[PDB]
From a paper:
Changes to the occupancies or configurations of these cofactors trigger conformational changes in the surrounding protein, regulating the activity of various effector domains in natural and engineered proteins. To test this prediction, we evaluated how ligand binding affects the [name]-B domains of the human HIF-2*α* and [name] proteins, both of which are involved in the human hypoxia response and contain internal cavities known to bind artificial small molecule ligands. We used the same approach with the [name] [name]-B domain, which has the same fold as HIF-2*α* [name]-B but contains smaller internal cavities totaling 150 Å^3^ in volume.
We have previously used NMR-based fragment screening, isothermal titration calorimetry (ITC) and microscale thermophoresis (MST) to identify several compounds which bind [name] [name]-B with micromolar affinities; two of these, KG-548 and KG-655, are further known to disrupt [name] [name]-B interactions with coactivator proteins. To gain more insight on how KG-548 and KG-655 bound [name] [name]-B, we used our pressure NMR analysis, confirming that [name] [name]-B retains a flexibly-accessible interior cavity with a stdev(c*_i_* [^15^N]) of 84 x (2×10^-10^ ppm/bar^2^) (**[Fig fig4], S5**). However, similar studies with the larger KG-548 ligand show a stdev(c*_i_* [^15^N]) comparable to the apo protein, with an observed value of 96 x (2×10^-10^ ppm/bar^2^) that suggests that this compound binds in a different mode than KG-655, potentially outside the cavity. We subsequently verified this external binding mode for KG-548 by determining the X-ray crystal structure of [name] [name]-B with this ligand soaked into the crystal (**Table S2**). In these cases, high pressure NMR – using rapidly-acquired spectra without needing any chemical shift assignments – indicated different binding modes between the two ligands, with KG-655 binding primarily to an internal site while KG-548 bound externally.
Residue numbers in the entry:
A (entry chain B): 360 to 465
B (entry chain A): 361 to 465
Write the structure that this text describes.
Amino acid sequence: PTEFISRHNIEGIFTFVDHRCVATVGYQPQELLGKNIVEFCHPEDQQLLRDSFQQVVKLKGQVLSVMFRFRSKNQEWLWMRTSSFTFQNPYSDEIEYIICTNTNVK
Amino acid sequence: TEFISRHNIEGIFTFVDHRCVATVGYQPQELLGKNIVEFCHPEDQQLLRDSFQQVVKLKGQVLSVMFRFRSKNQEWLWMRTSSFTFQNPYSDEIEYIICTNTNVK
Ligand SMILES: FC(F)(F)c1cc(-c2nn[nH]n2)cc(C(F)(F)F)c1
């Protein structure tokens, strides 16, 4: 396992994480759910990650990738590549979620 | 490259991200409402069917399968799909299967 998929609200809160997060970043799903992904991001990378979330909602379903350091469970910084896109449905004007694929770089 | 698709329990495309164009040659609109098994080489079709039956039993754990996908220009592309069932946090009901689809080459 190299990656896991997460669903976020527009502000960055984890609302679903697949069980591969254990092998990838060391956390059980319940240790991520309800928290903001930005809370696991190295301070120096935090604005970069915030901008990505603002930009991905403008791209309207097109994918945006970003790299940043993620705080693993054993308190080491892991280089992470996240590819993000918005999810919507056509009986709605609202962008409902952001879908992220979170891949451990090395 | 790769794209994410959302499926019902039987394999019907209910969402596909736009990277499907570069990966398999179809617009999302050309896949939606169809079963992924309809794009699968006959020889791989039972293997892909079993995967959908098995992934629902694995309850959130990932299952990978490889199969040949009929691209838009009518060539067989080897695909690696990693699948897991999705349910809302702390909620029991399986709503969808999520697939990450890579053309292996
Ligand atoms: F993050 C995931 F769990 F993997 C996910 C959830 C949903 C969904 N959430 N509520 N309804 N669908 C939709 C997608 C997709 F973008 F692939 F379609 C992915």
